[PDB]
Structure formats: structure tokens, C-alpha cells
Amino acid sequence: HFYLETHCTIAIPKGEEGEMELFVSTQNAMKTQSFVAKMLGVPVNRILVR
Amino acid sequence: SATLLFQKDPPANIQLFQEVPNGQSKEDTVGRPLPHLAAAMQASGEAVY
Amino acid sequence: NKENCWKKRGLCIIPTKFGISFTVPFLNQAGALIHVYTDGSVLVSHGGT
Numbered sequence A: 001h002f003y004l005e006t007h008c009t010i011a012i013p014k015g016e017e018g019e020m021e022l023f024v025s026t027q028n029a030m031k032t033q034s035f036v037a038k039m040l041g042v043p044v045n046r047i048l049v050r
Numbered sequence B: 001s002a003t004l005l006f007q008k009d010p011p012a013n014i015q016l017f018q019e020v021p022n023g024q025s026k027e028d029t030v031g032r033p034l035p036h037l038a039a040a041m042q043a044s045g046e047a048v049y
Numbered sequence C: 001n002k003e004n005c006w007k008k009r010g011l012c013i014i015p016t017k018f019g020i021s022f023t024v025p026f027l028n029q030a031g032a033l034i035h036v037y038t039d040g041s042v043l044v045s046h047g048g049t
């Protein structure tokens, strides 16, 4: 692909109820959210992707 | 009594409220004394201000 | 009060009523936003804090 900006993610752990807010260079916020959630073992509503 | 030093008395606390209908689902918490959802995190200092 | 010269007890019972609603009509409005994600978990958002 050679997108000038390579892959990048910033994940912010709140410390409450497994909550996490992520800033990601992605075309798929949904999958990023569910995939992060699945790996963590928390409901999808705990993950916010921006 | 004017010569008596302050004496704390024994506390007494009673709360009265109504129970929910006998046939109300265990998952329907409306009317039940459910603790504040963030209370555990507030007690642990994890709640973020 | 008859048995005490320098200490007295008082007792009072009072009622109260409080009108419910912003007295500014247009403030009596509320909104909510709800998302159900594919895992079935729900995320509720509303105007209150």
C-alpha cells in the first residue's frame, strides 16, 4: 500500500470497568473495537475507537 | 446536668421502604435498592474525576 | 425541661412540598442516544450528568 502514514494506534486505559479509548489510523473502527474487546474479554460497549 | 461533660448516646437507624411486586423479575431492578454503579470503584479510588 | 435548668429540649414537626420542573418551560426537555453493538452490549448516552 505504501500509505505515507504507516499503521499507528494510541490506546488509553481509563481504569474503570475495563474501559479503553483508542486513537487509530484505521478504515474500520468497528472491527478495531470488537477485536480489542474480544482480546480484553470485555463487552464491546466498553471500548471507544476514534 | 450543667456539670456533666458531653456524653454521646447510642445511635439508632431505621429505614423503611416498599418491596417490589412479588412476581417481579430478578432482572427488573426498578424499585430495588441497587447500589450506585460506580460505588465499588469510588471506594477503591479507581473512579476517575 | 422541668428537671433541667441549664439544658432544654425542643421538638418540632414540619411539612414541605416542592414543585417539580424547571420554572423556565423550555428547559424541560431531555434527549438520549442508544447504541446496541453486535455483541448485544448496549451503550446508553443521555443529556444528564
Ligand SMILES: O=C(O)c1ccccc1O
Pocket: C021, C022, C023, C024, C027
Ligand atoms: O428550578 C427551576 O425552576 C430552575 C429554572 C431555571 C434554571 C434552573 C432551575 O433549577
